[PDB]
């Protein structure tokens, strides 16, 4: 009953360091570029969030989509003490193994493991998870959920002037409607990053919105 995500966590476990946050991503990172492809790694895309997540000391994130917690990994190994990252996974197995490579990394304190649809978990945060405002929201699930999730987060009271969304493959496979919204939205002020996909030979990129606030009613 072997899958790729059991293989990338054994690699992870044999290669890197117990504790270590950057050997466990450069672990899965040569995994994947060697001996299989999975979804939601790659340092370059990295290297944007790093920054991201550097510029805005968020001290709450949520994270849609951790698939086997790479960019958890990512993202906890950079938060302050007392900094919280609340992660989404729709799939069991994937969640089981989005914990294991915390625990590995060490991180396991710093992120919540949430199993279940974004689209249910998202209103619980406040009643649930004692969260008033998000300071961060990274988006790499479902590419037609970037869209509702992020109207269903404004509609919760959950985003804030100055919360940071950050969305992978917006352009590859591409998110349309989400982009034309943001971009055409004066809520959010929008920010490009490209990041090219070096073996597929094709350029993806991520979106920054930072939410300005909600839009004013017409006096
Ligand atoms: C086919 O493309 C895919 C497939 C899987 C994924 C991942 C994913 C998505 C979710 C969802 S979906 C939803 C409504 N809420 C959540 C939390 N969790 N994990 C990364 C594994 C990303 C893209
Ligand atoms: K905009
Ligand atoms: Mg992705």
Redesign the pocket.
């Known amino acids: 009953g072997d899958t790729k995500e059991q293989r990338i966590l054994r690699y992870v476990q044999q290669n890197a360091k117990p504790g270590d946050p950057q050997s466990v991503l450069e672990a899965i990172d040569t995994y994947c570029t060697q001996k299989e492809w999975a ?2 790694v790659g340092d370059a895309k990295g290297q944007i969030m790093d920054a991201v997540i550097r510029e805005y000391s968020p001290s709450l994130v949520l994270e ?4 086997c917690g790479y960019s958890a990994v990512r993202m906890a190994r950079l938060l302050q003490p007392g900094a919280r990252l609340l992660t ?4 069991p197995d ?1 969640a089981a193994i989005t914990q294991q490579m915390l625990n590995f990394a060490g991180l396991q304190d710093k992120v919540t493991i949430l199993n ?4 249910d978990l998202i209103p619980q945060l406040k009643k649930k998870y004692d969260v008033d405002t998000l300071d961060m929201v990274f988006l ?4 037609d ?1 970037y869209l509702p999730d992020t109207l269903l987060l404004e509609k919760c009271g959950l985003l804030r002037k100055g919360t940071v969304l950050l969305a992978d493959n917006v352009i590859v496979p591409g998110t349309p409607d989400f982009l034309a919204y943001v971009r055409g939205s004066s809520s959010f002020e929008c920010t490009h990053y490209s990041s090219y996909l070096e073996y597929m030979k094709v350029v993806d990129g991520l979106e920054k919105a930072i939410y300005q606030g909600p839009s004013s009613p017409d006096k």
């Open positions: 979804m939601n849609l989509g951790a698939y989404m996974e729709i799939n994937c279940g649809a974004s689209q790499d699930h479902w590419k959920r």
